[PDB]
Amino acid sequence: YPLASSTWDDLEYKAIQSVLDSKMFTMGEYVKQYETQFAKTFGSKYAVMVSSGSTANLLMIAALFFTKKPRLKKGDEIIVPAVSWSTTYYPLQQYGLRVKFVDIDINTLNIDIESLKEAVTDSTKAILTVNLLGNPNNFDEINKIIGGRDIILLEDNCESMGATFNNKCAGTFGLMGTFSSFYNKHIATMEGGCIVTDDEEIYHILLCIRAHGWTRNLPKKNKVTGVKSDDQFEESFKFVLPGYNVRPLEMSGAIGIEQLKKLPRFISVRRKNAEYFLDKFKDHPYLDVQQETGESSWFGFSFIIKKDSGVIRKQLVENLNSAGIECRPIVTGNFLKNTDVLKYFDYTVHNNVDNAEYLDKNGLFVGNHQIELFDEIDYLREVLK
Amino acid sequence: PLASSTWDDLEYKAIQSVLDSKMFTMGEYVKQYETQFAKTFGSKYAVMVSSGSTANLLMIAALFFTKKPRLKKGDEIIVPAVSWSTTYYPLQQYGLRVKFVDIDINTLNIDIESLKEAVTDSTKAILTVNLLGNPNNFDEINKIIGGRDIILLEDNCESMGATFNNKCAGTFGLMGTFSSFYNKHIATMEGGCIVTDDEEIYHILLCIRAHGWTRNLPKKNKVTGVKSDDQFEESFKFVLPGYNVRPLEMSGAIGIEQLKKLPRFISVRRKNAEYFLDKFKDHPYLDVQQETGESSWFGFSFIIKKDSGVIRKQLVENLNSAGIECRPIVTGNFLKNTDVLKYFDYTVHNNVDNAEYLDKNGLFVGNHQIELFDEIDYLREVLK
Ligand SMILES: O=C(O)CCC(=O)C(=O)O
Numbered sequence A: 001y002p003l004a005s006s007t008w009d010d011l012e013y014k015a016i017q018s019v020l021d022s023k024m025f026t027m028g029e030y031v032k033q034y035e036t037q038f039a040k041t042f043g044s045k046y047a048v049m050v051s052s053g054s055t056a057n058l059l060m061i062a063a064l065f066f067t068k069k070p071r072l073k074k075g076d077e078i079i080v081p082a083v084s085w086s087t088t089y090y091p092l093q094q095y096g097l098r099v100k101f102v103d104i105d106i107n108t109l110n111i112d113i114e115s116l117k118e119a120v121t122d123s124t125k126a127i128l129t130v131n132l133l134g135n136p137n138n139f140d141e142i143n144k145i146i147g148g149r150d151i152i153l154l155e156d157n158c159e160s161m162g163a164t165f166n167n168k169c170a171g172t173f174g175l176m177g178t179f180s181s182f183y184n185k186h187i188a189t190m191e192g193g194c195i196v197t198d199d200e201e202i203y204h205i206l207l208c209i210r211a212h213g214w215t216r217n218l219p220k221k222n223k224v225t226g227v228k229s230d231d232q233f234e235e236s237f238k239f240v241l242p243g244y245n246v247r248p249l250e251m252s253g254a255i256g257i258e259q260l261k262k263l264p265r266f267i268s269v270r271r272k273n274a275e276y277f278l279d280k281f282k283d284h285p286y287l288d289v290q291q292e293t294g295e296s297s298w299f300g301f302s303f304i305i306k307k308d309s310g311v312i313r314k315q316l317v318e319n320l321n322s323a324g325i326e327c328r329p330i331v332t333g334n335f336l337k338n339t340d341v342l343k344y345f346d347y348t349v350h351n352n353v354d355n356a357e358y359l360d361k362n363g364l365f366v367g368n369h370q371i372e373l374f375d376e377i378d379y380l381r382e383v384l385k
Numbered sequence B: 001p002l003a004s005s006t007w008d009d010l011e012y013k014a015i016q017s018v019l020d021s022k023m024f025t026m027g028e029y030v031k032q033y034e035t036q037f038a039k040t041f042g043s044k045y046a047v048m049v050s051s052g053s054t055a056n057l058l059m060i061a062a063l064f065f066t067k068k069p070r071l072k073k074g075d076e077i078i079v080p081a082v083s084w085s086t087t088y089y090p091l092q093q094y095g096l097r098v099k100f101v102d103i104d105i106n107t108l109n110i111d112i113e114s115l116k117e118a119v120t121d122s123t124k125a126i127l128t129v130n131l132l133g134n135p136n137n138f139d140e141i142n143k144i145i146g147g148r149d150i151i152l153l154e155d156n157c158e159s160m161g162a163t164f165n166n167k168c169a170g171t172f173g174l175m176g177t178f179s180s181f182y183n184k185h186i187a188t189m190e191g192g193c194i195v196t197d198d199e200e201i202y203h204i205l206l207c208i209r210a211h212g213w214t215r216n217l218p219k220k221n222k223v224t225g226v227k228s229d230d231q232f233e234e235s236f237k238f239v240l241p242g243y244n245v246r247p248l249e250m251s252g253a254i255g256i257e258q259l260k261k262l263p264r265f266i267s268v269r270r271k272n273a274e275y276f277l278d279k280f281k282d283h284p285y286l287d288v289q290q291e292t293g294e295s296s297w298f299g300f301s302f303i304i305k306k307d308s309g310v311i312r313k314q315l316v317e318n319l320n321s322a323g324i325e326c327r328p329i330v331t332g333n334f335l336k337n338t339d340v341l342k343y344f345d346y347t348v349h350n351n352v353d354n355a356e357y358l359d360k361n362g363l364f365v366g367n368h369q370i371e372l373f374d375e376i377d378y379l380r381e382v383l384k
């Protein structure tokens, strides 16, 4: 039982072969297409490909500072959840925003709705939601706590590509949504990330900031510079926004196109595996599993040691490993235990983070893949007895 | 054209190898490549990252995380007025105040007499850029810093392989940055490196490159001191506000190959330049670059002589219709970029008259690792 498995076939391999014979390796044809199908795939107007889910988060944030009428500015308050990957947080700190952490809900593993409604205020300029483990946030309920102030909605959808709510694609709820194409995820392009949006102005700020803050990937009339000059001796060396060089590589673009085709069955295998998993673990003596929302893409399986259950986490761990079972902390556990990097943040905690503290000491995680795991899952129910 | 393919069958083979091992995330190849890279330019340590741009990005951020921080926001760092955009963004992104310094019209590197004046009690750092393969005269810059606590940095993206005083450009500063982007000296599709002789700096980079986690860090390290054995925990701890800027295994593998070739690329580039200089030596209206130490001859700049009476624009039209692909020297005068400068906290030491001038009567055509005698002769003729 591995936390991970390959998602490639010969198709990806000749996809690489193909980018070779072209002898055009820098972000190009492949990307553009991948970016087109990506959007077609999840129901957005615009998608943008970058070097990683991480850089996609960097860009998602940086962007809101370059809108003609800026949407964020330093010191602004943005709310986020206590549980998520490191790079969900960094950008906030890098852009000098004031972070308000909010305890997650122990059943869904996502951000606590009651806790949220009470933490959102006048100052709250944005809400950075995170779809944890394929599980989407209940967006209807988030949209009510907001309704209908001028408060930004974004989603780090890096763990839940293919998840859905009300039959709306996760990642497509935010003003911007991010995805990650890193090895261990739903699809793998070696490294890769994607930002979608339906917002024209955001779209263009992205194009610009992903590559040097120049104008070459911008259209003749754009939402940033207005009208590009025809004199390439000048228009080609014009810098309009402090960006980065976050270009994805043609190869990833080409691999992505492919992965996007296997996606559906990828997602089918996973939900059928989860179905089963839930059956086998339904009424467990000492562990709770994730409470699903919408239709999850089931990144992995989380377990949470039942309160007053006398079981000791590092005992189960031993057991699983000794049984050839790969397991790990859910995501990264309580992000707030990271006292050191925190000293660099301008953050605060709403109420408490008791749930995350509890998930930090009592939670474990085992993977889900896009190949059947009935057997293994069967073996898992035995070890955990 | 202007850019050209530095690849033979070996790099293609390297790529298979990675496919074969079926391990595409920053792993062994990167590590070998970093080891070889260090030993190659004679630096203690090396770190490889996604592009040259993320190389400079990390260089700046790194100084912010040392136990005893070398830079704090609003600190003064000096830079010359001519370079590639990503040399600047990082300072802006880091909240530093930037004092621009004019280049010297001969070397195209920062003018020393101005630096001599520009440097003050508040000046905390100095970021030099070896332009077009040309190294800066470090002897006079070190002289100028004297023995003061002033950090010297290098953006060595256009001058990989050049040398000054027998020492390798990129290795004079606390840190140095290289690019292995398509059109550069070597090419790993995309990619860059950071070199340093400082261990805590080393450790910090390994940490900021990858989620500011501890994984690429040694047991006893400069950032956390001493890692624990419980990976359940250790493997999920985060200590610095880093990024995800991991280069690709495939880019690591390609680099190593590129690395053996270099020396030769370099002889051919230098070879070409030599022919070049004899050919435009006494040009009636064109000024070329004055070499310092041993340029790696990134490409060929031309600066229209004062008085000449010749228009930059016609030189272009000409080169074009002669199918010779040309461009701006680097990006020309960076300061003309008003819209972005809006986001900076900057100042201009005196004036950048030279930058101003280069921008309008300067043009560049490239240099490649294959012998170009004939093109140069046609060049001379076209630029009659
Ligand atoms: O290391 C990465 O790029 C992805 C890390 C991640 O997503 C995870 O392990 O949760």
Ligand SMILES: O=C(O)CCC(=O)C(=O)O
Pocket: A245, B084, B181, B330
């Ligand atoms: O495309 C890039 O990465 C920028 C290349 C560069 O530095 C140049 O054109 O001078």
